[PDB]
Copies of this chain bind each other. A is one copy, B any other.
Amino acid sequence: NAQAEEFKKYLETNGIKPKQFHKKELIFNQWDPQEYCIFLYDGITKLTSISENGTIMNLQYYKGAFVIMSGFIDTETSVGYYNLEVISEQATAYVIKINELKELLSKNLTHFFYVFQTLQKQVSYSLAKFNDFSINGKLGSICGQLLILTYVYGKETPDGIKITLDNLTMQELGYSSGIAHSSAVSRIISKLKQEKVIVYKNSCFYVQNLDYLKRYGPKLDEWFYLACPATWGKLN
């Protein structure tokens, strides 16, 4: 990603260093009175909301490169009581305080625009997710996430398009789709297996009917088409 690399160089130029986080660590948390701008350069994370009764809600998933900000750029106050938890084994992020961000993005407008469009990708992603769910329910959400994962991490193998992710637990799949119950997800994931849309052969998932996923996750497909056309065109 060119825009993400040039932004990386820009941060290091201005002294900001990368920080290594291991699985289950929180890059930022919902109790910190200080808010940050996280430039997730490598790895996978998820946005959570730990309610008072201890229940963890999974709201969004991110992979580097991307930008996740915990506070409003103007007021510097919380946009929501969320945490950014690492779910890959390791992750690499640049932690920035918001006040420092405004200064940096004011010296270079090109990178300001890079951060600006990451928020736009978020807005349209959520709506797209909500669109597919409204049409095809949980099936649309699951097919949508699997499709996106196939665009990003898919590779050609004799047994279909292999999703090249370590520890892609079937429960990790049911959260980005918007389901907290492992049984209701197990139902759809099994049906997909029975209809041979996917196959779990040795460690990883294999997509076999890619057209099937495009059929029930159309708006998330149109989102990836409009947002990442180069990667989209690899399997279209």
Which A positions have Cβ atoms within 8 angstroms of B?
3, 47, 49, 51-52, 57, 59-60, 69, 72-75, 77-82, 102, 106, 109, 112-117, 119-124, 126-131, 134-135, 178, 180, 218-219, 222-223, 226-227
A119 — which chain B residues lie within 8 A by C-beta? Answer: 116, 119-120, 123
Task: Give the docked Cα–Cα distance between A79 and B126 (Å).
Answer: 12
A-B contact list, 25 entries, CB within 8 Å: A47-B127, A49-B219, A52-B218, A57-B134, A59-B127, A72-B117, A72-B120, A72-B227, A73-B117, A73-B120, A75-B117, A78-B226, A79-B123, A79-B124, A79-B227, A80-B128, A80-B223, A82-B127, A112-B112, A116-B116, A119-B119, A119-B120, A126-B126, A126-B127, A129-B130
Given contacts A51-B135, A51-B218, contact A79 B120 (CB under 8 A): yes
Task: Give the docked Cα–Cα distance between A222 and B52 (Å).
Answer: 13
User: In this complex, what residue of B is CB-closest to A103?
Assistant: B109
16 further A-B pairs in the complex, CB-CB below 8 A; given A3-B74, A102-B113, A129-B130: A47-B127, A51-B219, A60-B127, A72-B227, A73-B117, A74-B117, A80-B226, A112-B112, A115-B116, A116-B116, A119-B119, A122-B123, A126-B127, A126-B130, A134-B178, A134-B180
Find A106's partner among B52, B78, B109, B114 (CB 8 Å cutoff). Answer: B109
Task: Give the docked Cα–Cα distance between A117 and B218 (Å).
Answer: 29
A115 — which chain B residues lie within 8 A by C-beta? Answer: 116
User: In this complex, what residue of B is CB-closest to A218?
Assistant: B51
A128 — which chain B residues lie within 8 A by C-beta? Answer: 80
Task: Give the docked Cα–Cα distance between A42 and B75 (Å).
Answer: 24
Contact check, B222 vs A80: say whether CB atoms are below 8 A apart.
yes
Task: Give the docked Cα–Cα distance between A213 and B217 (Å).
Answer: 32
* Chain B proximity of A128: nearest CB distance (Å): 7
